Design a protein around this ligand. Structure first.
Ligand SMILES: [N]C1=NC2=C(C(=O)[N]1)N([C]1F[C@@]13=[C]N([C]1[C][C]([O])[C]([C]OP([O])([O])=O)O1)C(=O)[N]C3=O)[C]([C][N]C1=[C][C]=C(C(=O)[N][C]([C][C]C([O])=O)C([O])=O)[C]=[C]1)[C][N]2
Ligand SMILES: [N]C1=NC2=C(C(=O)[N]1)N([C]1F[C@@]13=[C]N([C]1[C][C]([O])[C]([C]OP([O])([O])=O)O1)C(=O)[N]C3=O)[C]([C][N]C1=[C][C]=C(C(=O)[N][C]([C][C]C([O])=O)C([O])=O)[C]=[C]1)[C][N]2
Lengths: 264, 264
């Protein structure tokens, strides 16, 4: 996609070499913002084939409040394997904060349901937020939330959302994050009877791993094809009732896939 | 400042009329990003005179972990008056989350001290964050955090910071937020022996109240003067030991102040 290849190039032209947790080394920029009008198409990268099955199920997994990779495995999704414990546990990552943020006073907050209530009763609210950065539980998570806080906004009968992604692997991670969030906006909007607006992505440390340079030059030489169209076939009773089979991505014709190693 | 007047104009040209909590009405845009290189000057608005005494003390107040407006009053700062309870309490707003985020398990996390430790021992970390959005305590805060999550970044021996501000009153609020955060970056960098890099501001619902339109046209007609220079006179032993008198803003010569009513 135009904006994504423009991010890649900018990392190439402006990133400074940085050491990283994984010991891999990256080219890094701090602070970037891009916007996707969802009415133009489903922002799924076309310059490389993206694994939709993985993107969809990770989202559905988050929405169930699950942190065990079992449901993923059941579905042949193996992207969270390197971080899971002996039992397939990741700790209180995404799903748990989204669906049951534990309170000092021993309560559990379902931020997703809170959001639905605000979108249905107070659409102009400037406080419609979901946060996965629960400071009192970071020590228990296998990985700190990469996509860590997002805000919804309604204007003109359209639903928009902004994500703050603190750390972004541009090659592997980004294509997934973008589609994933675009998907959630489409789901929330159907549930709330709104049209989709914009997906605004904001990044903190946005980087290219050093062992993804060939993969990058490769992709940078391909021309973006037209964005597909997302079709949601049925309207579940709740945000918690979508099924993989309810989604249809129409006219996705990507260039071929590019393998790249994941940094652990 | 150039970037700030450009934001104001864009709100004017592109904002859609929106109802708001306060019942005032605004012109609103969703998603905006601006960057300030701190080496160019202290980003204090010049097209209107800003009250530095208020900006400085609010910051020092946050750093003490205080949520009672008493210290402010002692110092002739009255900007938090409309929201304080009978006792001058605001609830667990900013200072409390920054210095003592209460954990499910009954612990208190000092995110500020955690940050210092990460900047001194792991500068390349992509997890140096302070969050005031404690979901389990929003119901107790007088106002939900407007500036709600910020991230630090080190590259090339320079310290950068990105703020996610969920809601922004462009006229009253922004000039204060910008200077405030620029100030904290200068303080952290002195404590860590780094040079200042960039201040990246990212906004969610960025708006102009409807009863600030005259004030806006007025300011928009003034030409920005040169940015002042911040001088920090001494190096306290800790981030918690700065005093008002330790800061000097050199060459601040603003156009005159513009009064505008605050929306409650
Ligand atoms: N390196 C890495 N790691 C990880 C990831 C990535 O992406 N990369 N992921 C993701 F949560 C997340 C994060 N991120 C990143 C950022 C950084 O770089 C990291 C972290 O670190 P710190 O240090 O900062 O903390 O990470 C991002 O970006 N985002 C987000 O969200 C996870 C996992 N996931 C995944 C993986 C992998 C994949 C692949 O490979 N894919 C492929 C295929 C498909 C199949 O399955 O086959 C393609 O695409 O091709 C995906 C996903 C965690 N970790
Ligand atoms: N309206 C309003 N309110 C408030 C404020 C403002 O600004 N405005 N502040 C600020 F925390 C904060 C917030 N913000 C805002 C956003 C919105 O609009 C609001 C909230 O709502 P929601 O609904 O969203 O929740 O708010 C922002 O922006 N930011 C931030 O941070 C506070 C208080 N503060 C203040 C006030 C006032 C002032 C003034 O007036 N100043 C003047 C003067 C000085 C002396 O003092 O004189 C000038 O500047 O001229 C300041 C500050 C809270 N609330």
């Amino acid at each position: 996609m135009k904006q994504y290849l423009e991010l890649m190039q900018k990392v190439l032209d402006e990133g400074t070499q940085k050491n990283d947790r994984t010991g891999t080394g990256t080219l890094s920029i701090f602070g970037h913002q891009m916007r996707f009008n969802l009415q133009d198409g489903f922002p799924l990268v076309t310059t490389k084939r993206c694994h939709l099955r993985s993107i969809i199920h990770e989202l559905l997994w988050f929405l169930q409040g699950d942190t065990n990779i079992a449901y993923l495995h059941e579905n042949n999704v193996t992207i969270w394997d390197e971080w899971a414990d002996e039992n397939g546990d990741l700790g209180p990552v995404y799903g748990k904060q989204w669906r049951a943020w534990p309170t000092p006073d021993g309560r559990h907050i379902d931020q997703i349901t809170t959001v639905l209530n605000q979108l249905k009763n107070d659409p102009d609210s400037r406080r419609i937020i979901v946060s996965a950065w629960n400071v009192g539980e970071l020590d228990k998570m296998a990985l700190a939330p990469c996509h860590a806080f997002f805000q919804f906004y309604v204007a003109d009968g359209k639903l928009s959302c902004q994500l703050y992604q603190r750390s972004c692997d541009v090659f592997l991670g980004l294509p997934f994050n973008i589609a994933s969030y675009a998907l959630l906006v489409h789901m929330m909007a159907q549930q709330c009877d709104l049209e989709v607006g914009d997906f605004v992505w904001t990044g903190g440390d946005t980087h290219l791993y050093s062992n993804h340079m060939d993969q990058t030059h490769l992709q940078l030489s391909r021309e973006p094809r037209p964005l597909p169209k997302l079709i949601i076939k049925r309207k579940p009773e709740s945000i918690f009732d979508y099924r993989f089979e309810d989604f249809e991505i129409e006219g996705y014709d990507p260039h071929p896939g590019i393998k790249a190693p994941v940094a652990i």
